Amino acid sequence: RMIALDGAQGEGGGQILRSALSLSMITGQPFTITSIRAGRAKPGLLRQHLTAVKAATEICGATVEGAELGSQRLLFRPGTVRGGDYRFAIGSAGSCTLVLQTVLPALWFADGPSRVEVSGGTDNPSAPPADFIRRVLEPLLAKIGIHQQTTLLRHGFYPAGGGVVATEVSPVASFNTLQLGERGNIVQMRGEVLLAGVPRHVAEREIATLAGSFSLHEQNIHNLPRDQGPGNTVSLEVESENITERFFVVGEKRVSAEVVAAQLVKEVKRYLASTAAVGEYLADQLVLPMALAGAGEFTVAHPSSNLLTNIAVVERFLPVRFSLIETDGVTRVSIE
């Protein structure tokens, strides 16, 4: 019929819109959404979100009202999803991977394989980096029966953008059940620094803090052509017996190498402080694929607003329901 969604839900960001676009394409159910990002510094559709709407529109021949920069309202009636070889340009440092994450789930069901390439930003602090998608999310997707491979082709830092990320995706043959319990013990930890036009010694300082706090099996420093923008990110990948997670921070002006790694160091100990398998962000990114599989579960410490939003949107579009039960500070998120 028509699903009316309130864009003020949760933290009131673009996440509710991207999740709705995915589920709408998949199920054929139209939706309307009002108050899109209405309370944010730059409200309504930004170029990342408009590019997401454009891509969804193009892949499924949708009928759409309000696809314009700044629009706080959208109505979307999906048509038939077509596989193919698609290319989209954000035109800003907006997140490539968030555009990808909007349309890839629709392509899981399409006729044959597809490829999607997006240009834009690649190292936004509040989006999944390509390496997170590739090394943390995609291995779990494969366990659920979903096969996609993401590759970062070029880095694009804020504000210039001009990075490129592409994903090859195939339709699901069959779903499997993935049940994540505890993190298990550490198998190893790997620290990584990216530099583009930033003094080499910064990376050195950053790696130091991580060590002496953790035992690192790897310590990696990646240098890019400064022309690829002034940019600096610090990552820590945590491989445990049951799962691999990965966390990152983006260095900025007025912040010291020691404290950026300090922020990252803090986040990692928050993750390690609990027995939960999945970190804060990965949790929200597993909701849709598990819902589409019709089964699955994971543990997370302190379910985020985005996790709860994604669950709510999934339950509006699909006949699945999630149970959330906390045991000793860890929440088990499961399909009933």
Ligand X SMILES: Nc1ncnc2c1ncn2[C@@H]1O[C@H](COP(=O)(O)OP(=O)(O)OP(=O)(O)O)[C@@H](O)[C@H]1O
| CA–CA gap between residue 143 and residue 167 (Å, rounded) | 18
Is residue 306 near ligand X by the rule CB under 6 A? yes
Is residue 15 near ligand X by the rule CB under 6 A? yes
Tokens of 59: 């892949």
Tell me the three state secondary structure of residue 39. coil
Is residue 128 near ligand X by the rule CB under 6 A? yes
Residue 105 sits at the vertex; the CA angle it makes with 34 and 293, to the nearest 5 degrees, is 110
Is residue 14 near ligand X by the rule CB under 6 A? yes
**Helices in the chain by DSSP H: which ranges?**
15-27, 47-60, 96-107, 130-132, 138-144, 200-210, 257-272, 280-293, 305-317
Least distance to ligand X, CB of residue 15, Å: 3
Q: Identify which range of 8-16, 108-116, 162-170, 235-243 contacts ligand X by CB under 6 A.
A: 8-16
Tokens of 135: 């090394």
Is residue 134 near ligand X by the rule CB under 6 A? no
| Residue among 302, 305, 309, 304 at smallest CA distance from 331 | 302
| CA–CA gap between residue 87 and residue 117 (Å, rounded) | 5
Burial of residue 139 (number of CB atoms within 10 Å: 0-12, 13-18, 19+)? exposed
The smaller minimum CB distance to ligand X, of residues 119 and 246, is found at 246
Q: Identify which range of 6-14, 23-31, 146-154, 326-334 contacts ligand X by CB under 6 A.
A: 6-14
Helix (H) or strand (E) holding 326: strand 322-327
Is residue 120 near ligand X by the rule CB under 6 A? no
Cβ-based neighbour number of residue 161 at 10 Å: 23
Q: Identify which range of 107-115, 127-135, 161-169, 320-328 contacts ligand X by CB under 6 A.
A: 127-135
Pairing of strands 186-196, 216-224: parallel
| CA–CA gap between residue 104 and residue 39 (Å, rounded) | 28
Contacts of ligand X in 16-45 (CB under 6 A): 37
The smaller minimum CB distance to ligand X, of residues 169 and 249, is found at 249
Single residue of 33, 118, 127, 288 touching ligand X by CB under 6 A: 127
Is residue 158 near ligand X by the rule CB under 6 A? no
Q: Identify which range of 84-92, 121-129, 175-183, 314-322 contacts ligand X by CB under 6 A.
A: 121-129
Burial of residue 218 (number of CB atoms within 10 Å: 0-12, 13-18, 19+)? exposed
| CA–CA gap between residue 90 and residue 111 (Å, rounded) | 26
What binding mask, one character per residue, do residues 255-284 give for ligand X by CB under 6 A, x or -?
A: --------------------------x--x
Tokens of 194: 């990216």
- Considering CB under 6 A, how many residues would be counted as binding ligand X? 16
Q: Identify which range of 79-87, 122-130, 190-198, 201-209 contacts ligand X by CB under 6 A.
A: 122-130
Distance of CA 144 to the CA centre of its chain: 17
What binding mask, one character per residue, do residues 186-225 give for ligand X by CB under 6 A, x or -?
A: ----------------------------------------
Is residue 132 near ligand X by the rule CB under 6 A? yes
Is residue 148 near ligand X by the rule CB under 6 A? no
Is residue 71 near ligand X by the rule CB under 6 A? no
Is residue 285 near ligand X by the rule CB under 6 A? yes
**Residues interacting with ligand X, by CB under 6 A?**
11, 13-15, 37, 48, 98, 126-128, 132, 248, 281, 284-285, 306
